[PDB]
Amino acid sequence: SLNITGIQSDWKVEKIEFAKLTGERARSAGANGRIGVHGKSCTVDIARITIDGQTGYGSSIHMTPEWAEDVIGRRLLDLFDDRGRLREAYRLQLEYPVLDWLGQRQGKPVYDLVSGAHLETGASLVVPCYDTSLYFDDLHLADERAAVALMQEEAMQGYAKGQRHFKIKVGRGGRHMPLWEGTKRDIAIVRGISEVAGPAGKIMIDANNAYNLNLTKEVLAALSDVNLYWLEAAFHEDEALYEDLKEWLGQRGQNVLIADGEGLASPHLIEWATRGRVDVLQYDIIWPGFTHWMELGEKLDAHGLRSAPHCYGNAYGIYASGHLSAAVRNFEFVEYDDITIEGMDVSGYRIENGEIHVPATPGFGIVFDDELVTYLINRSGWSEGH
Numbered sequence: 116s117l118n119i120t121g122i123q124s125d126w127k128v129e130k131i132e133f134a135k136l137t138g139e140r141a142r143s144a145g146a147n148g149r150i151g152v153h154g155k156s157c158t159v160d161i162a163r164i165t166i167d168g169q170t171g172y173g174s175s176i177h178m179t180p181e182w183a184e185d186v187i188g189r190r191l192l193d194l195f196d197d198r199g200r201l202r203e204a205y206r207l208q209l210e211y212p213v214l215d216w217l218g219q220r221q222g223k224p225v226y227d228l229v230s231g232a233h234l235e236t237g238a239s240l241v242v243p244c245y246d247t248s249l250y251f252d253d254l255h256l257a258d259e260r261a262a263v264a265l266m267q268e269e270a271m272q273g274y275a276k277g278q279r280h281f282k283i284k285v286g287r288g289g290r291h292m293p294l295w296e297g298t299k300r301d302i303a304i305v306r307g308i309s310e311v312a313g314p315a316g317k318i319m320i321d322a323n324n325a326y327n328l329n330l331t332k333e334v335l336a337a338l339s340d341v342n343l344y345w346l347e348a349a350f351h352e353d354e355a356l357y358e359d360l361k362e363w364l365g366q367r368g369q370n371v372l373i374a375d376g377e378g379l380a381s382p383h384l385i386e387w388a389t390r391g392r393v394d395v396l397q398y399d400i401i402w403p404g405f406t407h408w409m410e411l412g413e414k415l416d417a418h419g420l421r422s423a424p425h426c427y428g429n430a431y432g433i434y435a436s437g438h439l440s441a442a443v444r445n446f447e448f449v450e451y452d453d454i455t456i457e458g459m460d461v462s463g464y465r466i467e468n469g470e471i472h473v474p475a476t477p478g479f480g481i482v483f484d485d486e487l488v489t490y491l492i493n494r495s496g497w498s499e500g501h
């Protein structure tokens with residue numbers, strides 16, 4: 116659904132440059148259900164592409180100097196297929212710098228270039244978001260009251276910044292705490308954060324597969340008074356288990372969506388979703404990526420299914436995810452982590468009242484510090500072309 120009618124055939128890839136940018140998230144992220152402390156440090160691998168004397172920037176992965184050497188000289192148009200879709204071989208390495216480039220050259224935000232029927236030209240793009248940063252930051256505290264207070268204060272930091280919806284890590288009893296104790300702590304923490312967000316705040320819980328079906332049912336029942344919007348990764352996806360869970364929720368009149376799709380997903384997950392076992396699909400916004408998601412999102416829309424791309428671990432993906440919502444009707448939320456990357460100015464985006472306002476400026480609306488990136492390319496990155 117990309118508009119590529121205005122791409123001249125004389126337009127060629129002149130130069131490809133690469134650098135890793137670094138920074139930090141606002142608050143160090145602790146453990147989750149399956150692994151240890153995530154930390155405070157953040158990076159974003161970036162490529163700067165030069166086509167017809169103009170540059171575009173974006174996320175770039177799986178690219179080597181040798182790989183990029185072979186792309187120099189090519190016509191932009193030959194990277195696309197007739198259908199208007201960037202070819203598979205170029206997506207992970209180049210889709211973002213290319214889309215940004217196209218927006219810069221055409222003077223349009225990417226969302227305008229990939230817009231679908233549900234967003235009419237000229238209207239501001241405002242997308243729902245949630246605060247994804249509520250990890251197991253309480254583990255060093257033995258006292259439940261203190262643990263709840265600490266997690267409430269973390270949610271409040273988000274609320275103070277304009278967040279209204281919160282995704283809370285649960286599954287403490289899977290690995291990090293004794294089973295029963297950790298499960299009681301999960302419940303106390305979720306109720307606690309519920310009180311910060313208030314009755315209109317959507318609460319998501321993510322167990323990172325630390326539960327089984329019966330632990331999940333115990334937790335859902337305990338939280339029947341919380342405004343639980345969705346349950347994510349209760350346990351590794353399994354059609355029989357989710358069918359059972361959906362029937363149990365149905366009998367209770369408990370309206371909680373099932374979300375899944377991150378990491379090494381079941382190859383049949385979308386099929387299970389079309390049969391009604393899973394409601395929200397969560398493939399990563401970087402890999403498989405944006406071009407993949409535009410196609411997938413249309414398919415899911417047709418099936419009446421929901422999209423919520425995963426973004427954790429790459430600040431750039433937050434902003435990409437925002438633009439993707441213009442192409443996907445049943446887009447749910449931007450997964451938001453508060454991160455400062457040196458040289459990557461995202462002040463064009465704003466969080467207000469549980470939504471992220473996407474700027475109407477060209478490409479992805481992110482302003483990279485050209486001189487800093489030039490320095491980093493020299494210092495530790497690389498360059499192909501001239």
Ligand SMILES: [Mg+2]
Nearest residue numbers: 321347348377
């Ligand atoms: Mg998750």
Ligand SMILES: [Mg+2]
Nearest residue numbers: 352375376377
């Ligand atoms: Mg899963």
